[PDB]
Amino acid sequence: SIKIGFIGLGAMGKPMAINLLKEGVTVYAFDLMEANVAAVVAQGAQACENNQKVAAASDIIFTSLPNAGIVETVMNGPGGVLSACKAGTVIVDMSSVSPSSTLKMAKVAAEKGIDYVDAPVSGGTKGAEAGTLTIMVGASEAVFEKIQPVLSVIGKDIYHVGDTGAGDAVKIVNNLLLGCNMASLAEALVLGVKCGLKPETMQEIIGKSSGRSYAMEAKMEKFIMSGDFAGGFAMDLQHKDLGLALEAGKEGNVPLPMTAMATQIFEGGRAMGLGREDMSAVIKVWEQMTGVSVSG
Amino acid sequence: IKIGFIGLGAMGKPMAINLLKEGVTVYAFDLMEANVAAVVAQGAQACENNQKVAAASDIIFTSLPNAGIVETVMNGPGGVLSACKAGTVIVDMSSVSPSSTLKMAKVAAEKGIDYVDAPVSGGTKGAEAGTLTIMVGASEAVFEKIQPVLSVIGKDIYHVGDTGAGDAVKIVNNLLLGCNMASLAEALVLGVKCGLKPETMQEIIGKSSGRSYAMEAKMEKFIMSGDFAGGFAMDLQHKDLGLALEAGKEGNVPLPMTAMATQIFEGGRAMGLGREDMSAVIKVWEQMTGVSVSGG
Amino acid sequence: FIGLGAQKVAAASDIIFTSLPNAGIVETVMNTVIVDMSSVSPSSTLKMAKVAAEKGIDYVDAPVSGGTKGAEAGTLTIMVGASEAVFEKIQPVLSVIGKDIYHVGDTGAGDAVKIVNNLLLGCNMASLAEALVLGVKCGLKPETMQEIIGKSSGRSYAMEAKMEKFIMSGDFAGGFAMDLQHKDLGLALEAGKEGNVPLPMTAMATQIFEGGRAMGLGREDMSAVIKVWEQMTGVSVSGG
Amino acid sequence: SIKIGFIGLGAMGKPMAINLLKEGVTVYAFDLMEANVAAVVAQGAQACENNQKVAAASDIIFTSLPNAGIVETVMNGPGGVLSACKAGTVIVDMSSVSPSSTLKMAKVAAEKGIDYVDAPVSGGTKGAEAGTLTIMVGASEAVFEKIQPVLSVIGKDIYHVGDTGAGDAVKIVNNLLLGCNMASLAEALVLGVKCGLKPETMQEIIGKSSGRSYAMEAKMEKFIMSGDFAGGFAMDLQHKDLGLALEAGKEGNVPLPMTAMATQIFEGGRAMGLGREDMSAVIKVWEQMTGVSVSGG
């Protein structure tokens, strides 16, 4: 009986909608690309002419937009999603944005009797397809219990991480650490090579020692030692993530010196045209400056 | 077999005892009385000075504070090197640059003395249990010669490369430990400010791409408990970061993340936290912001 | 004058002055010559100039320095991004309210130069803060440092302006608010990101000033950022 | 008949000795390089066989050595200068070293009745020749008054900056700021150019604005805009100075984040082979990384 809406049907939105449809959940949908609407309508989705129509028909609405500015335009802007929602509707914003962004939307939403929830996800498109996404939720207890059953169809590990802004927050904190750990690894590996260590032995030893991190596990063999930096996690995206951390630090008055430094190092890689390569490509900032070769 | 100990610190003492427990002959001298007496009770043969330990021993262990003191002890007037019989191996566990050890192996070699860097990790508890991780820079021939003795005092014995490369790999590992911790410190304070429980961050980040051994070693035992007694002293982690920066300067390798981590740990030392576990560096940000992480 | 800080007006005026808090408020308020003195990125101004140009309106960035005292005395330094023709047009009016009127380049270069200047002010101050604490810890009186460094190669306007009046007095009221200096450093980082120019010194200065803000020092003069190191180390400079 | 000694006669030592000789003060001297001793002996210096010889004959001894390690070797090492000094002798160490380096040495000197003072100088070789050096002295009041008249021949502005280690300290603090200000300038200028500013526009405007520094005044036109980074103040030396600051920060438990970052940026320049160029050549780090052209030539 509960009605689900999708404002946009991207790489994530589409498989999520399909998984909901396979549980016989009523799903309304609009996307600017017609073919995306048609893809889900074939699995039983009900197409809508625009965002407002999805809003008016739905109880729980999913969205994932590129930034806070677009969220505000879509939600609060002229003829916005918020104005077209019935009271008691829940908006589930999976956009990669700062907690403060979500807090300010939740405020405007609350006045209209609309519940606004940050629920960023991890697992990618493959996790989206399999319905195994990790979903980190910032909400009241009452609202989390409201939406949890629907979340449990599209994801596997559903975390109630705190109140509003907490989903966005935990993602930002995780990705900040990934970026910092990688930036630290980049210069460390160059130093080790300069001091006569083969990357193989640094991998073997540090991998079993206290210096180890997921950053190193994920990147050293596949990207750094291969020298193939195609694919993976784009340096531009990692940089964007570090910027979101810095935005959160500014808004919360929390100094972030390591994050700040990592951000500028990755900016160096971008300056060198490496933005679309996996983020571990940032090691090339140091290789080129020193003539030390790690990525053999 | 004749083992010698130039100095008998927190590490030297238990190492000598473990060797004595295997019935190996151990000669020893220390700066103070009581340390020699401690091991002589376990079967050690006391010596009047360094020069006397050197003459009697086949394998000599030392761990000195810096390269300058190594220089003075080894090569200085009436030094250890001059008193060693050819074919003697010196095992230097001092936290020093590879070049320091290179410089010293070169003078040793002309005397027919083998000089190997063998820094250790595991602390005094690992020293007592004989479970130290030992990272060795040496020739293959020299490693096989000392390995059986190393195997009594340590568990994981690594032949990491030739002379100094042992210093190098320890420096690279501990640099990463320090950077990963410094990054974690600010990240956790940000997360709490954005309304996350430390527990929550531990769960999620521990299972995601931000994770590191730093977090897994320190979070629950020290940070969440708020008990920063023991562990790995902030002074020692700072020293290690300094050795990295020395190596970076000597090799012309920029180390911006390391450099920033060093100054953050200096802040902790400025606050009187040098004797606490290195994770107490989080108090830098706690004091400045008023954000409390270190509670349960 | 849209606003009078420290379309009724639009329809009547030939030259309109405004200074708004950020680019978001500019594009709300905006979207004849418009002289935008707002503290914004060059790109922000470039977008507003393009929409303005479409309906025959000239849009210039003319950020100023000199503060309220310079505003009162009519001695403001004004940095202008515009065409030659448009600068020629507005210059006589600019010359009443300011002294040194610079035609720094075309649209936005005016934003650029103020951002680059204020970045350096912030970095120079952040560097000064830790330097002074080091000196005192090593047994130097602030007075001795002011004398020697003021005459040698370490000197900067930052030191010249802040050292005696704020730091040594300990009176951090007034001056140039730490929040505003931090805002300026942020604009530099925004420009660095947009232009793919690494700004490591700026980035660290920004975080050091954020520490001051975390300590509640945001409305004090920016040289108050020295308190970050004073509180952390126990070292006192800000007497004498 | 005060007796002055020189342990080494470099670019600074030589003209200092000559200025002292022109006041008719007795000057003893030794240097590894023989021609340096001959240069001053022609102006009336008395040559010595070695450092100890100079030490035994002199009341006030000048030295300027490359680092704290060499200071210890020369002063305290086997057959050192300290062992050969008579009690009441004053050592004036102009070496570029940390305050702690000097404090250690002063303590070993003090037990032998020898006064040890840090007196680093500024003004360069031209100031050394003209006798117009600025001299920053860390010492007791009694010891400063003792040596001040001799200092006043070789220098013009003689500062009693504090007790032992304060001369070293003030120099370190000044040069730290120079290095930081330059590092900040480097990235700032690249940003400005990328945003469409000419270097001339920035020099003109920032030079008359709150962003200005001596770093910018000294380097912008002569080195950066010319693109000629020959001469000036070597990047290696500025880097060394920033290292001394970090050493003092560690010893005093004073965090130095801006200094630390400046140090690593200048290390980048050294990594690119720029160590012998003027330190403003550090801007080439960002030019190479970005493709942005600021420096001329």
Side-chain angles (χ1 to χ4, degrees):
Chain A
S1 179
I2 197 174
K3 289 179 184 197
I4 309 319
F6 283 90
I7 303 288
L9 287 158
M12 304 290 286
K14 200 142 77 205
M16 291 185 332
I18 288 171
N19 285 334
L20 284 163
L21 286 167
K22 293 192 285 166
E23 306 300 333
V25 183
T26 301
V27 177
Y28 302 94
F30 172 79
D31 195 289
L32 279 305
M33 296 174 300
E34 291 198 286
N36 292 358
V37 180
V40 300
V41 165
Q43 303 304 321
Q46 290 194 235
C48 298
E49 36 274 82
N50 54 53
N51 293 340
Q52 283 202 306
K53 252 80 183 211
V54 178
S58 306
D59 307 337
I60 298 169
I61 303 166
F62 290 90
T63 202
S64 181
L65 303 166
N67 58 65
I70 295 172
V71 169
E72 185 175 308
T73 295
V74 167
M75 291 298 154
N76 196 202
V81 163
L82 264 16
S83 70
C85 291
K86 273 135 52 227
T89 303
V90 184
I91 290 182
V92 181
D93 193 353
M94 304 178 278
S95 308
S96 177
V97 296
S98 65
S100 67
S101 155
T102 293
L103 267 328
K104 100 84 148 284
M105 279 301 105
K107 257 218 202 183
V108 309
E111 196 280 339
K112 309 257 181 197
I114 301 163
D115 292 310
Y116 203 99
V117 165
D118 53 307
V121 308
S122 57
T125 41
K126 300 218 268 170
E129 288 169 10
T132 60
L133 289 173
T134 297
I135 304 183
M136 297 141 289
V137 185
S140 72
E141 186 49 51
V143 173
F144 178 77
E145 294 175 344
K146 224 153 169 220
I147 68 175
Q148 179 278 321
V150 174
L151 266 21
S152 294
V153 52
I154 62 167
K156 180 159 163 177
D157 295 344
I158 310 311
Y159 292 94
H160 184 25
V161 301
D163 218 319
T164 309
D168 293 330
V170 76
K171 170 78 104 163
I172 285 169
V173 170
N174 177 75
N175 294 355
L176 166 179
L177 291 170
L178 177 59
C180 287
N181 294 348
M182 179 65 244
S184 302
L185 185 62
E187 70 186 52
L189 289 177
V190 172
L191 182 65
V193 173
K194 186 71 184 227
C195 302
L197 298 170
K198 276 170 76 93
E200 290 80 351
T201 127
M202 283 187 283
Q203 199 205 13
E204 191 179 347
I205 280 108
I206 297 163
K208 303 178 180 194
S209 306
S210 56
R212 72 180 167 263
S213 64
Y214 175 82
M216 178 173 194
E217 287 158 19
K219 304 304 184 182
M220 209 176 143
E221 197 167 312
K222 187 179 170 192
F223 298 95
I224 294 167
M225 293 175 63
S226 81
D228 185 359
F229 295 99
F233 184 58
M235 191 182 299
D236 288 328
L237 219 197
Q238 178 59 254
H239 182 80
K240 190 188 179 296
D241 289 348
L242 291 164
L244 287 167
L246 294 176
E247 185 194 346
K250 167 168 188 165
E251 292 164 343
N253 305 302
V254 175
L256 295 172
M258 298 294 287
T259 303
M261 183 53 86
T263 303
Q264 295 312 139
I265 297 170
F266 281 110
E267 190 55 70
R270 287 156 37 98
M272 292 174 60
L274 280 17
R276 289 156 185 250
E277 297 186 359
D278 177 79
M279 35 123 281
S280 62
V282 75
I283 195 158
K284 287 180 201 174
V285 173
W286 306 133
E287 295 184 311
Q288 191 171 293
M289 199 180 296
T290 66
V292 171
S293 176
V294 184
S295 45
Chain B
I1 92 184
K2 291 89 95 310
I3 308 317
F5 282 89
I6 308 319
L8 196 71
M11 304 290 288
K13 257 210 190 86
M15 291 186 329
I17 289 172
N18 286 333
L19 284 163
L20 287 168
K21 300 210 83 138
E22 305 301 332
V24 325
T25 302
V26 176
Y27 302 94
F29 171 79
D30 193 283
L31 289 40
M32 298 146 203
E33 290 266 39
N35 292 358
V36 179
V39 299
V40 73
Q42 265 55 42
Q45 290 195 233
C47 296
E48 229 295 72
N49 54 54
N50 293 340
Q51 209 171 110
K52 255 105 188 219
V53 179
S57 305
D58 307 337
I59 299 170
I60 304 165
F61 289 91
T62 200
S63 180
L64 303 167
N66 58 64
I69 294 175
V70 171
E71 197 111 300
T72 295
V73 167
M74 295 311 306
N75 195 203
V80 162
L81 264 15
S82 69
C84 291
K85 138 181 55 48
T88 301
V89 185
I90 160 58
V91 180
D92 194 351
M93 305 175 286
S94 308
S95 307
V96 297
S97 64
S99 66
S100 157
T101 296
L102 281 163
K103 185 131 204 140
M104 211 91 317
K106 203 161 211 71
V107 308
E110 287 158 285
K111 310 215 181 205
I113 301 163
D114 293 314
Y115 203 97
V116 332
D117 52 308
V120 308
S121 57
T124 45
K125 298 221 200 130
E128 288 169 11
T131 61
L132 288 174
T133 295
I134 304 182
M135 297 142 290
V136 185
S139 72
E140 186 51 48
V142 174
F143 178 79
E144 281 170 21
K145 189 158 57 157
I146 69 175
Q147 178 276 324
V149 174
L150 267 24
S151 295
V152 53
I153 60 167
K155 174 172 173 184
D156 293 343
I157 310 309
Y158 292 94
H159 183 26
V160 305
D162 219 316
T163 308
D167 294 327
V169 78
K170 169 71 151 184
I171 287 166
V172 171
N173 176 77
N174 291 358
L175 168 179
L176 291 170
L177 177 54
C179 286
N180 295 347
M181 180 64 244
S183 302
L184 183 61
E186 68 188 52
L188 290 175
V189 172
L190 183 62
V192 173
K193 187 72 183 227
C194 301
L196 298 170
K197 280 170 196 170
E199 287 85 338
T200 306
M201 283 188 282
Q202 200 205 10
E203 226 313 68
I204 287 137
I205 298 160
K207 290 174 166 267
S208 200
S209 56
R211 69 180 176 264
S212 66
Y213 176 82
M215 176 173 194
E216 96 178 52
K218 304 304 185 180
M219 180 89 154
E220 196 168 313
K221 188 179 171 191
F222 299 94
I223 295 167
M224 290 174 166
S225 78
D227 182 358
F228 294 100
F232 184 57
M234 191 182 300
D235 286 330
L236 295 181
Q237 179 61 261
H238 182 80
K239 191 194 289 246
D240 286 342
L241 290 161
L243 287 169
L245 294 175
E246 185 195 352
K249 168 169 187 168
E250 292 167 343
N252 302 302
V253 177
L255 295 172
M257 298 297 289
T258 305
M260 193 35 70
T262 306
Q263 295 310 139
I264 297 168
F265 282 108
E266 191 56 69
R269 286 157 37 99
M271 293 172 63
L273 279 15
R275 292 140 207 269
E276 298 185 4
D277 176 80
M278 48 113 272
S279 68
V281 79
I282 199 164
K283 297 181 194 184
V284 168
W285 305 127
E286 292 176 305
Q287 173 167 303
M288 190 181 301
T289 63
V291 176
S292 181
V293 178
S294 300
Chain C
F1 284 90
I2 292 295
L4 275 142
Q7 291 77 55
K8 304 161 210 69
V9 179
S13 304
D14 306 336
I15 299 170
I16 304 166
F17 289 90
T18 198
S19 184
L20 301 169
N22 58 63
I25 296 173
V26 172
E27 69 175 48
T28 299
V29 169
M30 291 309 310
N31 194 204
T32 303
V33 184
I34 308 301
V35 180
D36 194 354
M37 304 176 282
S38 304
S39 203
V40 298
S41 64
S43 67
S44 156
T45 298
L46 273 50
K47 289 151 183 153
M48 289 303 92
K50 273 176 279 297
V51 307
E54 286 192 68
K55 33 272 195 71
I57 301 162
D58 293 317
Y59 203 99
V60 328
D61 53 308
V64 309
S65 60
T68 48
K69 298 220 160 186
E72 288 167 14
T75 60
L76 289 171
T77 296
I78 303 182
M79 297 140 293
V80 186
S83 72
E84 185 51 45
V86 171
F87 178 79
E88 286 179 23
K89 179 192 286 188
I90 67 175
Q91 178 276 328
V93 174
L94 267 25
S95 292
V96 55
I97 61 168
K99 178 191 177 171
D100 291 346
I101 310 308
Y102 291 95
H103 183 27
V104 309
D106 221 316
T107 307
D111 293 328
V113 79
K114 165 46 64 197
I115 288 166
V116 173
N117 179 74
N118 289 359
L119 168 179
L120 290 170
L121 175 57
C123 288
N124 296 346
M125 179 64 245
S127 304
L128 186 60
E130 69 186 50
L132 290 174
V133 172
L134 182 62
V136 170
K137 185 72 184 226
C138 298
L140 299 173
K141 288 185 73 162
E143 286 91 342
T144 301
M145 284 185 289
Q146 199 206 13
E147 162 74 345
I148 286 61
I149 298 162
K151 278 172 68 218
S152 197
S153 56
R155 91 180 81 115
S156 61
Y157 175 83
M159 177 173 195
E160 185 178 351
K162 305 304 184 181
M163 182 68 177
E164 197 167 315
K165 187 179 171 191
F166 299 93
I167 295 167
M168 295 184 308
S169 78
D171 180 358
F172 294 101
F176 184 57
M178 190 183 301
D179 287 330
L180 294 177
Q181 178 61 260
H182 181 81
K183 178 182 177 195
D184 286 341
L185 290 161
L187 287 168
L189 296 174
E190 185 197 351
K193 168 166 188 167
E194 292 164 343
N196 303 299
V197 174
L199 295 171
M201 297 295 290
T202 303
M204 283 315 314
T206 303
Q207 296 312 137
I208 297 166
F209 282 110
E210 191 57 72
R213 286 157 37 101
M215 293 169 65
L217 279 15
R219 305 236 48 66
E220 297 184 5
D221 178 81
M222 49 111 274
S223 66
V225 75
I226 194 165
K227 292 175 186 182
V228 170
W229 305 126
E230 290 175 304
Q231 176 168 292
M232 195 183 304
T233 60
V235 175
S236 193
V237 186
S238 67
Chain D
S1 71
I2 193 70
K3 303 306 181 198
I4 308 317
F6 282 89
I7 298 173
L9 286 166
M12 304 291 284
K14 193 195 128 156
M16 291 187 327
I18 289 172
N19 285 333
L20 284 164
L21 287 167
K22 283 195 274 68
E23 305 301 331
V25 337
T26 301
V27 175
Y28 302 94
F30 172 80
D31 195 302
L32 269 41
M33 294 153 288
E34 295 161 307
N36 292 358
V37 178
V40 299
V41 306
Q43 267 67 56
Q46 290 195 234
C48 298
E49 195 185 65
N50 53 53
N51 292 339
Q52 295 194 317
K53 286 266 275 66
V54 179
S58 305
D59 306 336
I60 299 169
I61 304 165
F62 289 91
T63 200
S64 182
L65 301 168
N67 58 64
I70 295 173
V71 171
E72 287 191 72
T73 296
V74 167
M75 295 305 294
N76 195 203
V81 163
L82 264 15
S83 69
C85 291
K86 180 62 68 153
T89 302
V90 184
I91 311 298
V92 180
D93 195 351
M94 304 177 280
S95 305
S96 183
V97 297
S98 65
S100 68
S101 153
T102 295
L103 272 335
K104 266 191 259 83
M105 210 84 325
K107 273 272 280 186
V108 308
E111 55 161 322
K112 301 179 155 168
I114 301 162
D115 293 314
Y116 203 99
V117 329
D118 53 307
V121 307
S122 58
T125 46
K126 299 220 160 185
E129 288 168 12
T132 61
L133 288 173
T134 294
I135 303 182
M136 297 140 295
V137 185
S140 72
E141 186 50 47
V143 172
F144 177 78
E145 292 168 30
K146 199 157 182 169
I147 68 176
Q148 179 276 325
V150 174
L151 267 24
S152 294
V153 54
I154 61 168
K156 176 164 164 172
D157 291 344
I158 310 307
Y159 291 94
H160 183 27
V161 303
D163 220 316
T164 307
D168 292 331
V170 75
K171 180 98 185 167
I172 286 167
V173 170
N174 177 75
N175 294 355
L176 167 178
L177 290 169
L178 178 56
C180 288
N181 293 348
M182 179 67 247
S184 301
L185 186 60
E187 70 188 50
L189 290 177
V190 170
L191 181 62
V193 171
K194 185 72 183 226
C195 301
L197 298 173
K198 294 130 73 154
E200 318 90 74
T201 303
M202 285 185 288
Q203 199 206 14
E204 185 184 13
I205 290 173
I206 298 160
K208 308 188 201 330
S209 297
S210 54
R212 73 178 168 271
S213 63
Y214 175 82
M216 179 172 189
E217 284 138 44
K219 305 305 184 182
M220 180 69 172
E221 196 167 317
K222 188 179 171 188
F223 299 93
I224 294 168
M225 295 184 69
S226 80
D228 179 0
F229 294 101
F233 184 57
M235 191 182 297
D236 288 328
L237 295 175
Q238 178 60 260
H239 182 80
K240 187 196 194 280
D241 286 345
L242 290 160
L244 286 167
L246 295 177
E247 186 195 347
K250 167 168 189 165
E251 294 161 342
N253 303 303
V254 174
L256 296 171
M258 298 296 288
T259 303
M261 284 328 299
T263 306
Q264 295 312 141
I265 297 168
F266 282 110
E267 190 57 69
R270 288 158 34 102
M272 292 173 64
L274 279 16
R276 293 283 83 208
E277 298 186 5
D278 177 78
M279 50 98 270
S280 60
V282 75
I283 198 167
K284 293 184 191 188
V285 173
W286 303 129
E287 295 180 311
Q288 178 55 49
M289 200 180 294
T290 63
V292 173
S293 178
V294 183
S295 67

